[PDB]
């Protein structure tokens, strides 16, 4: 006979607050410009995809770019989709973490729409890292990023004790 037993297991007490994805609102004003720009990149020539706009869409190149090889470009922006199925959780639990230790001004934007499976199915993987050094796009990227899309860290900034979190899991035991 099978009996269900609840076992107490210690949770990471701050992983919910470490994965508090930033507050994004009035976001359909942004996907129009972003998707139109990405399509206009991806139409003509694979060299002309990355020749006027330098962007990296492979996670190994994201790690090698944020390691410290290129230090000139200080404003560098990232776009990562959450709340979207068919997206790996192994990278997604480490993407907002690796950008924190980067000395460059890296600006993560979490895309909140679940229906946005287009950018993953089209370009590479569903993430986008590019540079706003002298491009035209920064002329609106600096406009809205101060409004709603602010990214700051409250969790490591001040000194604060954290309460413990002990959860409990299901276990089916046959006897």
């Amino acid at each position: 006979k099978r009996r269900q037993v609840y076992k107490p297991v210690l949770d990471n007490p701050f992983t919910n607050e470490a994965h508090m994805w930033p507050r994004v609102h009035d976001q359909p004003l942004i996907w129009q410009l972003l998707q139109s720009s990405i399509i206009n990149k991806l139409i003509h020539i694979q060299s002309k995809e990355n020749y006027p706009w330098e962007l990296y869409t492979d996670f190994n190149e994201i790690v090698q770019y944020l390691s410290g090889a290129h230090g000139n470009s200080d404003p560098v922006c990232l776009f990562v989709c959450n709340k979207d199925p068919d997206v790996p959780l192994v990278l997604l639990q480490q993407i907002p973490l690796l950008c924190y230790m980067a000395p460059m001004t890296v600006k993560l934007v979490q895309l909140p729409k679940s229906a946005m499976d287009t950018f993953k199915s089209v370009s590479k993987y569903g993430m986008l890292l590019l540079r706003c050094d002298d491009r035209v796009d920064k002329k609106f990227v600096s406009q809205i990023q101060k409004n709603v899309d602010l990214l700051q860290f409250p969790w490591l900034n001040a000194i604060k004790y954290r309460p413990t979190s002990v959860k409990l899991l299901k276990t089916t035991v046959p006897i």
């Binding site: 000194i159 004790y161 309460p163 413990t164």
Partner: protein
């Protein structure tokens, strides 16, 4: 070089606590060479003239808020110390203190067989089996302090959130428990002959 040190965590911890003592001795030598008694001028003097020597020096001013607040808040949550104090239960609290780890505690040598060990306050960076490791500041001394536990009495204050009205003070004895924290998680402490505790009646 870096891989051969951290192959075992205990040996690298021993190398670090030896390097801190050697750097403290070099700091005392450079301080007598400096002839300045102020420690805030001494730290800037080391920052100006000795960059590689400054790298392994401890930072007690950083060490106090990063440890004391977490330790006091953990004890206020664990022992159920709240604004309501008239519902306290002491035996279960002493059992929890027997079960809680003292890694990161502020602790004071109040009585000892050696007359020079007393008066030392310090914060735990690691609990040994039969010795004890703390850190204390002097005028210019920042040495990692090793103190024996066989024949010493230790005390620690548990504050209450009210200001200057009431606070608690508890005491442990390192000659009583002489084991690792790992064994202390499972050990149920029992009676002893306690014949060698005459010093606690003597001084």
């Amino acid at each position: 070089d870096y891989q051969r040190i951290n192959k075992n965590s205990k040996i690298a911890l021993r190398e670090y606590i030896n390097n801190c003592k050697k750097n403290t001795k070099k700091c005392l030598k450079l301080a007598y060479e400096n002839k300045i008694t102020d420690k805030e001028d001494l730290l800037h003097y080391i920052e100006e003239k000795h960059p590689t020597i400054y790298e392994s020096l401890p930072q007690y001013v950083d060490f106090v808020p990063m440890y004391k607040e977490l330790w006091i808040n953990y004890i206020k949550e664990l022992l159920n110390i709240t604004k309501n104090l008239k519902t306290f239960n002491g035996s279960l609290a002493l059992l929890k203190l027997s079960m809680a780890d003292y890694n990161g505690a502020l602790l004071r040598v109040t009585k000892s067989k050696n007359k020079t060990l007393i008066g030392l306050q310090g914060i735990v960076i690691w609990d040994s089996q039969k010795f004890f490791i703390m850190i204390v500041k002097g005028n210019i001394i920042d040495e990692i302090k090793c103190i024996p536990k066989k024949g010493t009495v230790f005390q620690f204050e548990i504050p209450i959130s009210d200001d200057d009205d009431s606070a608690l003070r508890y005491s442990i004895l390192g000659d009583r428990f002489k084991y690792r924290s790992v064994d202390r998680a499972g050990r149920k402490f029992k009676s002893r002959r306690c014949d060698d505790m005459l010093y606690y009646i003597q001084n």
